[PDB]
């Protein structure tokens, strides 16, 4: 990568999968090497080794290298020190959760556990940011009422809240986007939706414009237009 970054000076790409294996490998050798084991058993040089590696992946004035790093979280515990110190060196993360996988949403990205320093009302403008703000608030409310929902029915929630809950259930279903690489597995032809289109699609849903059609309509389908059509498909 460095040869491309530096010597060729042309923008590159980089994929790393898994950088947990990098940490893990170090922990195995560490014991044999003769180091007093650090917590969970990780190598004491965990911080330095990860640090050095992650600063050898960077965008210099010489070149810009987009990198994609894949972290096998062991037992899916983010509190584990190796995943934790990984979280520190990333510029954006989109943690994908087993729970959201169980919900059947592929992509299974947890929506309350994603961040980018590129999500800002300057970077993607106020309108995008406003759209995102409402999604976050709606989903967080939905997460908040999960206890109450389980203990007592949704009918025993406030009417105002019931609108929120219904909207959020729709948002959750809406978020699934069939993937063409996963076309085999899903059995649904993948669809890529424009950034301009995405903001529009969510904006409408947030204003409840197309909230009047089943959750199943939003389930495993692409953009807002596709949802409208899929309502017709279901309606038949």
């Amino acid at each position: 990568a460095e040869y491309f970054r530096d010597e060729e000076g042309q923008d590159v790409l980089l994929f790393i999968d898994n950088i947990f294996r990098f940490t893990q490998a170090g922990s195995e050798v560490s014991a044999l090497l003769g180091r007093i084991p650090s917590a969970v058993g990780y190598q004491p040089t965990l911080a330095t080794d990860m640090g050095l590696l992650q600063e050898r992946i960077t965008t210099t004035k010489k070149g810009s290298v987009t990198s994609v790093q894949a972290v096998y979280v062991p037992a899916d515990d983010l509190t584990d020190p190796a995943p934790a110190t990984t979280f520190a060196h990333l510029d954006a993360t989109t943690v994908l959760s087993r729970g959201i996988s169980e919900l059947g949403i592929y992509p299974a990205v947890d929506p309350l556990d994603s961040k980018s320093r590129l999500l800002d009302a300057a970077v993607v403008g106020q309108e995008h940011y406003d759209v995102a703000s409402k999604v976050q608030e709606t989903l967080q409310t939905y997460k908040s009422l999960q206890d109450i929902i389980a203990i007592l029915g949704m009918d025993e929630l406030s009417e105002q809240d019931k609108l929120t809950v219904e909207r959020a259930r729709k948002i959750q279903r809406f978020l699934s986007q069939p993937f063409a690489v996963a076309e085999v597995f899903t059995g649904i032809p993948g669809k890529l939706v424009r950034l301009k289109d995405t903001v529009a699609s969510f904006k409408a849903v947030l204003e409840g414009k197309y909230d009047n059609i089943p959750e199943h309509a939003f389930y495993m389908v692409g953009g807002i237009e596709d949802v409208v059509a899929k309502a017709e498909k279901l309606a038949a």
Binding site: I36, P37, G41, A150, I151, L152, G153, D155, E156, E159
Partner: protein
């Protein structure tokens, strides 16, 4: 911690289970009194209906509805509220008298225009003639009931002892008595103002019956609902129990490892 936060949360769930259990039992007790009342009331109602049927009962309006102050009676409050909303599409601008808070709030959302009179302080008690009589008396004076050519009352008919279907029925105006051929099936002179008396009397008698049907449906629903709550809570006890057990084991392991690491050195 993990350990304590699991434990306190599990304790909460346990206490919740206990409360939902307690309510469900108490609900059964309370329900027995309610059902007894509903029989007696319905029998009384049948006598009034005997007149109206035999008479031929042929008919801004009034809408009256009943749902207690208190909630957590399942979806009694909101199934009736929804059934008001549909027939308040039907009515142009009818004045809704809401007997008890839970339906009042829901209807207030649907229109604040139509809400003119509402009650409060009914639900906690089992309906009694005293309540009905006073409610009727205020209904006549405040709402000027006769102005409405048709009145309709909404309540929850307790369809089966595990079901409730929100139900409505029409209270027959003094006009109805007048233009029904009830002269052909009964006899009054003219000295009595039998329309003005019978209207008033059946305004309350019909409402009391509706209240009794409703009260029984409320308590019955509350029993059904709190029972289903107990089941849901039990499942959560099991789910957090597994979490507790896992968490307990993990704590032992993690602490032990620290001890080993120290000892090894």
């Amino acid at each position: 911690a993990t350990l304590k936060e699991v434990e306190m949360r599990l304790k909460s769930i346990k206490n919740i289970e206990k409360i939902t259990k307690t309510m469900k039992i108490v609900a059964s007790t309370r329900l027995s009194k309610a059902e007894k009342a509903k029989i007696s009331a319905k029998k009384m109602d049948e006598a009034e209906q005997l007149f109206y049927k035999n008479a031929e009962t042929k008919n801004k309006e009034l809408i009256v509805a009943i749902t207690s102050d208190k909630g957590l009676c399942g979806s009694i409050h909101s199934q009736l509220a929804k059934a008001v909303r549909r027939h308040l599409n039907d009515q142009p601008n009818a004045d809704i008298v809401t007997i008890g808070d839970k339906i009042k709030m829901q209807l207030l959302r649907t229109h604040p225009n139509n809400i003119k009179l509402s009650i409060n302080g009914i639900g906690k008690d089992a309906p009694t003639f005293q309540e009905s009589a006073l409610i009727a008396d205020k209904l006549l004076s405040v709402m000027k009931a006769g102005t409405y050519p048709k009145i309709s009352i909404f309540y929850n008919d307790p369809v089966s002892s595990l079901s409730f279907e929100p139900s409505e029925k029409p209270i027959f105006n003094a006009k109805t008595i007048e233009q029904s051929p009830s002269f052909g099936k009964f006899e009054i002179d003219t000295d009595a103002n039998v329309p003005r008396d019978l209207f008033e009397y059946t305004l309350a008698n019909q409402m009391l019956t509706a209240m009794a049907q409703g009260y029984a449906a409320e308590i019955s629903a509350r029993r059904n609902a709190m029972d289903n709550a107990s089941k849901n809570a039990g499942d959560m006890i099991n789910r957090y129990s597994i979490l507790y057990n896992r968490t307990r084991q993990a704590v032992i392991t993690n602490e032990l490892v620290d001890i080993i690491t120290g000892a090894s050195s």
